[PDB]
Write an enzyme that holds these catalytic residues in place. Structure first.
Site, PDB file in Angstrom:
ATOM      1  N   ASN A  47       0.829  -1.204   0.000  1.00 52.87           N
ATOM      2  CA  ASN A  47       0.000   0.000   0.000  1.00 52.87           C
ATOM      3  C   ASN A  47       0.866   1.258   0.000  1.00 52.87           C
ATOM      4  O   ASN A  47       0.492   2.281  -0.573  1.00 52.87           O
ATOM      5  CB  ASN A  47      -0.931   0.011   1.220  1.00 52.87           C
ATOM      6  CG  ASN A  47      -2.396   0.027   0.834  1.00 52.87           C
ATOM      7  OD1 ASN A  47      -3.156  -0.871   1.203  1.00 52.87           O
ATOM      8  ND2 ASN A  47      -2.802   1.049   0.086  1.00 52.87           N
ATOM      9  N   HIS A  59      -2.693  -6.240   6.038  1.00 52.96           N
ATOM     10  CA  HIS A  59      -4.100  -6.180   6.434  1.00 52.96           C
ATOM     11  C   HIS A  59      -4.260  -6.929   7.745  1.00 52.96           C
ATOM     12  O   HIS A  59      -4.969  -7.927   7.821  1.00 52.96           O
ATOM     13  CB  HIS A  59      -5.044  -6.750   5.359  1.00 52.96           C
ATOM     14  CG  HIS A  59      -5.651  -5.716   4.466  1.00 52.96           C
ATOM     15  ND1 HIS A  59      -6.480  -6.048   3.417  1.00 52.96           N
ATOM     16  CD2 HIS A  59      -5.553  -4.365   4.456  1.00 52.96           C
ATOM     17  CE1 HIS A  59      -6.873  -4.948   2.804  1.00 52.96           C
ATOM     18  NE2 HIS A  59      -6.323  -3.912   3.413  1.00 52.96           N
ATOM     19  N   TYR A  62      -0.916  -8.628  -2.265  1.00 54.85           N
ATOM     20  CA  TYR A  62      -0.377  -7.306  -1.976  1.00 54.85           C
ATOM     21  C   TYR A  62       1.066  -7.261  -2.442  1.00 54.85           C
ATOM     22  O   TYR A  62       1.488  -6.295  -3.065  1.00 54.85           O
ATOM     23  CB  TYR A  62      -0.474  -6.992  -0.480  1.00 54.85           C
ATOM     24  CG  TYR A  62      -1.734  -6.244  -0.112  1.00 54.85           C
ATOM     25  CD1 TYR A  62      -1.677  -5.094   0.665  1.00 54.85           C
ATOM     26  CD2 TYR A  62      -2.982  -6.679  -0.553  1.00 54.85           C
ATOM     27  CE1 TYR A  62      -2.829  -4.398   1.003  1.00 54.85           C
ATOM     28  CE2 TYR A  62      -4.139  -5.992  -0.222  1.00 54.85           C
ATOM     29  CZ  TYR A  62      -4.056  -4.851   0.558  1.00 54.85           C
ATOM     30  OH  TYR A  62      -5.198  -4.157   0.886  1.00 54.85           O
ATOM     31  N   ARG A 102      -7.708 -13.122  -0.932  1.00 55.28           N
ATOM     32  CA  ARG A 102      -9.042 -12.829  -1.475  1.00 55.28           C
ATOM     33  C   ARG A 102      -9.051 -12.649  -2.997  1.00 55.28           C
ATOM     34  O   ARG A 102     -10.102 -12.759  -3.627  1.00 55.28           O
ATOM     35  CB  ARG A 102      -9.651 -11.599  -0.772  1.00 55.28           C
ATOM     36  CG  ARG A 102      -9.502 -10.247  -1.489  1.00 55.28           C
ATOM     37  CD  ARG A 102     -10.587  -9.242  -1.101  1.00 55.28           C
ATOM     38  NE  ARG A 102     -10.210  -7.845  -1.339  1.00 55.28           N
ATOM     39  CZ  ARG A 102      -9.378  -7.136  -0.576  1.00 55.28           C
ATOM     40  NH1 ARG A 102      -8.814  -7.671   0.501  1.00 55.28           N
ATOM     41  NH2 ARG A 102      -9.110  -5.873  -0.890  1.00 55.28           N
TER      42      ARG A 102
END
Length: 714
Positions: A172, A222, A231, A285
């Site tokens: 991120n 996360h 990620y 996910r």
């Protein structure tokens, strides 16, 4: 006006567009062109759009500017339909401004999703104006990048103007890179560039607690979610673009921290690759999207690996070059060029496959016990098969369910396992939608009903993880308590080179639902069908649950011998078997996907634990032909050392390797040779007149000396 700040947006443009390095008769580039021509055309010829009309869902704006980013590429493409087009250019200017004023200027706020206003959307502004800083003045570029500083005035944090921000961390933090680096260079706001990359240095630090990468190769992000390949994709693939820019700048990162790059590559990423698939357990996910199947998102790292190679020196270049080229050479199912959406990467890739100076290199056998995230990795070199063991502990989450994405992956970490045989298409071609979520391979589960509104939890137990002995011998464990606290079983796995035993004791259901372990749920490619041998003789399966009590063997013969899967049951057990066409859509397990019903055949195997105090103990031998599989089960008739309520272990007497797992601290004498004296997990080999010992206290993620945990008797 001509300047140096812009000569680095010239670099940027090349990495993300690649028009400089184009060729009209380069067969593969021209396939990505035809694509772009029709994209622009489907936007352009419909804008302002109903496809992206609804404003209050903010995901629609990213798509607005993202299809405006798509013009920019063709617009500034010397060999394209829309090269210097009067209307496509006008369209941009006119709906770059008409948008700015109405929807996207300062007197506004985040509704729907920040990630749009803040990340996905600005980079699409940044990317448009960059490729077309010639169809735009200086102060024009200023007017539109204003919004950026309003939503992201600080490269330490994200979600700023809202009322519980957070720190940009992991992959991120990479999108602080594009969103502010490029945005600065545009605005020549030179602080924006130095200020930022200071915080982009923060991602090169490994950790022992929190998000980001780990010492053991684990990637958490996360809160506590296995994400080395979801990620980690966003990270490696993002930072593999910033660095060509970042390093030419006036504030370039010290070549010290460019080393944690190759530690990511090898300790974290390389192990989750197999014949061109990134393991679906590392994806979390992301597995719930059709655009991002196992083999495709593997390229999202195989490019990020290469870009790094190009900007390296010496052995580091050529070996991280072989790493890539050999991996893509071993992928026989997917044409790698179908996830290269920029010509620099295509040019680069076609270079490798041409360049016979980069030696190919087979991969050695390897085992990576990523305990800090609860996944284990395994590949056999001799037999060509992979194996992954999706668990979770009290430290990590069973499954993520964000943005109404991944709504049926409940038990994909409840002891789930993945085999990777010669069916490369296995976990692809719509596997995830069409597979039974309830009967998930490897797991013990009752049969209550789950909703789609449920959330990822953690275990109440911490006794989980793996002791590692060598590239081909380890042991995992799991002190299971399930989803709703009805079923608590010990589950222990023993990977021993060319086989992997699933033990499990103390099975106890306090529930009126029938408990049941799933031995396997293989997808079946139609044009190569299985021949199922129960107990050495052939069978014929239907949608009907057949019964097979008194069942030593279960073998799955095939045309390809590297696609066989055998199941020796130490104690002749009572299983059931079937083979049904299961249908289902991607929309069911992730709301924003095609509802087009998709159909894929499955053969399922199972065990039902009726009585409170049941066991399950069997051995999976893949890539083994029928002839050999039968002489293997007689070879390991007495291989079960123990499988009771406080001790589970196998002996592989060919290697001489015990796999062992205690729960209490007692003195269990194994094979009459040694003892093992402590709670935890072991993996032990005899190679001489003495012993090679590997103990892992999973509770304290600690080991201990041989003296503390083991004395060989006499």
């Amino acid at each position: 006006v001509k300047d140096t700040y812009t000569d680095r947006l010239d670099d940027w443009n090349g990495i993300i567009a690649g028009n400089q390095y184009y060729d009209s008769k380069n067969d593969q580039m021209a396939k990505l062109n035809q694509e772009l021509e029709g994209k622009v055309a489907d936007s352009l010829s419909s804008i302002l759009w109903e496809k992206f009309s609804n404003y209050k869902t903010s995901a629609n704006l990213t798509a607005t500017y993202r299809k405006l980013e798509e013009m920019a590429k063709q617009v500034t493409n010397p060999s394209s339909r829309y090269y210097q087009d009067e209307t496509v250019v006008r369209t941009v200017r006119d709906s770059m401004e008409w948008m700015h004023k109405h929807v996207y200027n300062s007197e506004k706020s985040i509704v729907g999703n920040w990630w749009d206003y803040e990340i996905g959307t600005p980079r699409a502004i940044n990317n448009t104006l960059s490729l077309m800083k010639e169809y735009f003045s200086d102060e024009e570029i200023k007017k539109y990048t204003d919004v950026i500083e309003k939503f992201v005035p600080d490269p330490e944090h994200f979600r700023k103007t809202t009322d519980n921000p957070f720190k940009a961390l992991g992959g991120n933090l990479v999108d602080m890179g594009r969103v502010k680096v490029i945005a600065g260079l545009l605005r020549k706001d030179d602080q924006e560039i130095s200020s930022t990359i200071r915080s982009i240095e923060q991602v090169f630090k490994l950790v022992d607690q929190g998000e980001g990468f780990y010492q053991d190769g684990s990637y958490i992000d996360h809160t506590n979610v296995a994400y080395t390949g979801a990620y980690g994709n966003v990270l490696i693939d993002g930072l593999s673009q910033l660095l060509p820019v970042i390093q030419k700048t006036k504030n370039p990162i010290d070549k010290d921290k460019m080393q944690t790059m190759y530690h990511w590559i090898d300790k974290s990423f390389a192990p989750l690759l197999v014949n061109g698939e990134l393991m679906d357990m590392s994806r979390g996910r992301s597995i719930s999207r059709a655009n991002s199947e196992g083999h495709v998102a593997a390229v999202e790292v195989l490019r990020g690996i290469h870009r790094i190679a190009d900007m390296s020196e010496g052995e580091t270049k050529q070996r991280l070059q072989s790493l890539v080229k050999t991996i893509v050479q071993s992928d026989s199912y997917y044409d790698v060029f179908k996830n290269l959406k920029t010509y620099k990467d295509i040019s680069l890739m076609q270079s490798l496959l041409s360049d016979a100076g980069v030696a190919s290199v087979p991969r050695t056998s390897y085992l990576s016990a990523f305990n800090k995230m609860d996944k284990t990795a395994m590949y056999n070199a001799e037999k060509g098969f992979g194996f992954g063991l999706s668990l979770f502990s009290s430290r990590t989450l069973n499954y993520e369910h964000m943005n109404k994405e991944n709504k049926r992956g409940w038990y994909t970490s409840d002891g789930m396992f993945y085999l990777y045989n010669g069916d490369l298409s296995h976990y692809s071609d719509g596997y995830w939608p069409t597979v039974n979520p309830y009967k998930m391979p490897g797991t013990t589960e009752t049969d209550a009903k789950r909703a789609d509104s449920d959330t990822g939890k953690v275990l109440p137990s911490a006794f989980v993880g793996t002791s590692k002995l060598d590239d081909a011998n380890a042991t995992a464990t799991m002190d299971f308590t399930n989803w709703n606290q009805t079923l608590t079983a010990h589950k222990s796995w023993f990977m021993l080179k060319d086989k992997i035993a699933f033990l499990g004791s103390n099975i106890q259901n306090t529930s009126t639902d029938t408990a049941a372990t799933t031995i396997d749920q293989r997808k079946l490619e139609s044009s190569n069908p299985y021949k199922v041998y129960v107990n050495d003789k052939e069978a014929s399966l239907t949608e009907q649950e057949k019964d097979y009590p008194e069942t030593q063997s279960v073998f799955l013969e095939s045309s390809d011998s590297k696609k066989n899967i055998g199941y020796f049951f130490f104690k002749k057990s009572s299983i059931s078997m079937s083979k049904a066409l299961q249908k289902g859509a991607w929309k069911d397990i992730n709301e924003g996907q095609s509802d087009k019903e998709v159909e894929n055949e499955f053969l399922t195997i199972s065990q039902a634990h009726k009585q409170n105090g049941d066991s399950y103990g069997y051995m999976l031998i893949p890539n083994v032909d029928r002839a050999t599989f039968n002489q293997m089960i007689k070879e390991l008739e007495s291989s079960l050392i123990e499988n009771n309520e406080t001790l589970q272990s196998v002996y592989d007497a060919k290697q001489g390797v015990w796999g062992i797992v205690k729960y209490d601290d007692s003195v269990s004498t194994i094979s009459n040779q040694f003892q093992v004296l402590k709670r935890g997990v072991y993996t032990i080999r005899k190679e001489g007149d003495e012993y090679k010992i590997a103990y892992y206290n999973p509770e304290t993620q600690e080991s201990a000396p041989d003296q503390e945990v083991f004395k060989k008797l006499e």
